[PDB]
Amino acid sequence: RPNRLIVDEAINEDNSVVSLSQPKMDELQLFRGDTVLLKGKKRREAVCIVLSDDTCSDEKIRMNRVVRNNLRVRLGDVISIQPCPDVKYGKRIHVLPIDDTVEGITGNLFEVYLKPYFLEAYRPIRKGDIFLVRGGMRAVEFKVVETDPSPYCIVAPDTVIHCEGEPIKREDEEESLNEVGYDDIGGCRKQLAQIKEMVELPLRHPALFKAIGVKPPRGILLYGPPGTGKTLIARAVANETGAFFFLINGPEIMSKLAGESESNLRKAFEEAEKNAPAIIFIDELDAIAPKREKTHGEVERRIVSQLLTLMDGLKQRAHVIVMAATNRPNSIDPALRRFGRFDREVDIGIPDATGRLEILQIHTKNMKLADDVDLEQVANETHGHVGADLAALCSEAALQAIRKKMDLIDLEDETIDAEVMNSLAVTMDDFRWALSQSNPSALRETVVEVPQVTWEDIGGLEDVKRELQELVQYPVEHPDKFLKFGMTPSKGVLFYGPPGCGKTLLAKAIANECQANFISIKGPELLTMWFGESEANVREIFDKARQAAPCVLFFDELDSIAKARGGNIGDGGGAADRVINQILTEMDGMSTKKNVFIIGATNRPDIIDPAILRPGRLDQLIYIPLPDEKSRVAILKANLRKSPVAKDVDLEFLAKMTNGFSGADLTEICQRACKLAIRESIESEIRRERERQTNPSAMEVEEDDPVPEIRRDHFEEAMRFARRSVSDNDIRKYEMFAQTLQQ
């Protein structure tokens, strides 16, 4: 039959829209504006309006949450669709709210919720349904409890809405539309694709896995910093696929009494065994199952061995997925990694700059912002925040809009009128205030992301640019001809050259071009675990790079440890070998299937130990030279990305007076040149403001500042206070080393 289709979630809300492919309506004698009858399980009927969609397939119909909830269906089910454009106008409609949504609201709900909802929409409604209205500050749902004529009626401009009466008590067969779903998560697009793929099959059709006779998953382990939204992925998946989410907690198991903590676990798996396909979430796993060496007592060795014997006892029967959440995957007991136990592991990192914008638009959907808030600006300057912190920022900024309007609501009543709530607005003045007294909790944590540096951000050195392009893209984009021949693509690259010449910019740029993650380990960070702290740290950093394949790992100032060894004593020379030995031990273990690239930068190439340089490891030596003339003007242009329009600046004239400097020094020159220009503009406005002390508001033309009129003489005067940073001995040392390596 050409009626049964698969359903999926929408984007543009619109509680009375469904997306269908053009040919489907063409072959189903359907036309625009035709109301249709949708029928599903439990003999429930929902009336909607159809409209075309650009990218809708034939057999998939796109619809939002509210329409699905009325039909009592879930994702990926089948519905019955039939056109019935023979509805008769309703006369009087009785719409009443639900009890647990209007706590302390009162007021006239008709003229601030329903009035802007039905106005010029001609919404077709059916008896018994539920719809959700985004209020001024809340989200209030209603229930059409009576219609005339019954039950099909379309709301008309002449219809009497009887919105009076006590709220209806919430019944038992509803799914409580005000709960979590697949659209309440942002910044986790890839991870929520993996969890939904591994779980939707064992939980939606248990019968299929019995006939096929294959092994279903039995454990998923999500790790990441606290507050990043882990127990919301477990609550979203259980609410949409249909399951029996049964949470057991970390702290309250560990603190019941003596020996009866175990009887809490033993009878926790019992409900999940006799209550349909269930899902069990063990929060804070590291609180109850730490490493064997940190279990100093005995009753903490009884809980762990009681958790292991229950997981190994899950052999078929009902399908029960047990998921756990932990902060660090190193602190978990190693016995919880064998097969038949937690084996599939997912990583939930901190959000990136385009992720922090999506958390903002989710939490502020209920509020009514003013027309001056630039959510892009607030998103890009809050690095170091996790998902849970941006949910407090959007609340503190909401409290100002009532803190500064408290007089309007002076003591009010026990219930606050709804008219004043819809009159509120939140401006940038509040958001800048809630940002001040906020303490981000991520801060010191390695950030994995795709840097935004473009090729044009660096001038010259195009010969090196082609060289790096050959060793990265071609081995991964066109592998077939590499498949022929026993070719081994280079697994590493070493950069050596004069300091401040742009080594870190090259590694950032290539990662952006290939669109791969970037991880940077600094020098002083490399000596952090060099002393005292064991070499366990250098292990997980490679595992961190391993999971995020493809990525471009970067070691900055590799010769840091060698310089410490070189000295009066250098007693850490054997200790300096410790990190190198561990680095060497975990560099030959990389596989060709996973794409990981290692780049190390150094500035004393004659002091690096010969062990590192060897075939099979990072071995391509590249000498980065100082930029030359025409290239040395491109560095100057890298500071013209600001606005230093110095009249007839004549950059070519500025080019010929800037001979023989280094790379990073030139940018300092523009900053030094700009710094005095900022200062000089201060005296100009200080002169202007102290001159205005004589003339009271004598400003016929509106002008307050000279409007940044940056001058060239001001730029020229600063250049006079400039000295060459190029050292003749240093460049000569590298070139003879370059020739020695060349010959």
Add this chain to the structure above:
Amino acid sequence: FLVRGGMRAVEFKVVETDPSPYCIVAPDTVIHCEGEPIKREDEEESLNEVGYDDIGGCRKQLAQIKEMVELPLRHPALFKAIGVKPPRGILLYGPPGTGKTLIARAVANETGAFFFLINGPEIMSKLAGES
């Protein structure tokens, strides 16, 4: 009304007067100060316990505690209606003897609350697992 004494602060009570009730004291008036003193009755809080005028050297910090706690404790219903999350834990830290259990005793005695102190040493040493 509270009278500042030589070394104490004695507070009296106008228990009877004539002509009732508004009678300004005049340079020719009769004062009857003799009799057994009245028992301290309930309801009203004493005028001798701590308040906002009993702390000094902490004018800035007592401004941060006051703005964060005045709203949830004075208008419990408004936070229910607006439905925003309130603060749920405040951690005062500093050297001992600087007046921390006095900042938390002035806030309860002024906004109106049910200050219920639990102590460290007494909880820790009750009995085995009954603590």
Add this chain to the structure above:
Amino acid sequence: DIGDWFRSIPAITRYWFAATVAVPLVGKLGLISPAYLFLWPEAFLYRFQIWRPITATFYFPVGPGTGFLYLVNLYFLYQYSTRLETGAFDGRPADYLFMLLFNWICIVITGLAMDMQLLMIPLIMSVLYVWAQLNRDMIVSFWFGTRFKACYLPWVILGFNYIIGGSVINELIGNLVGHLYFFLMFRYPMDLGGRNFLSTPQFLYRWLPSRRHNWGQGFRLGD
């Protein structure tokens, strides 16, 4: 607790509760004559005896005898009288008032024909049986019970009170009188015909009104 919770019970059911608890209390202490409430059927066949047409329909000398039996039948009533009022009976108390009289006059006429003395259990289980058929199709499983399938309640409960005690007459009559009334009040009108020729008089509605959805007032059409 005793004050508001008793008021929380609906007045119709709370009156039934008061009648069923006050009478045994007087009996256990023994102020009035316990033998004064016997409902002699043979005396009725000779003389009208207007003294006791109703008095013996609520008396029960609970104590050293069938003490446990009275507790349980009152217990399911307390646990299930409240449930059945909430089941399609909140808006129709006058109908629920009526059939209470119908079983009461039906059991007593059959009771007066034969020579039993205490018609206490019949008036509890008759309405309880009527509940089951009119509220079928749910699963119930208490802590000390089995996992028996739904719609088995009237039959499984029937054996339980029968085997504990005896008096085969009262258990059998109470179920069938509910059965025929179930067929008459509910099944008869659309089976062959014979519609509701027992309509409650307006005087009952005048005493206690029914429930109707109060429309109120419609604000306006808008636009």
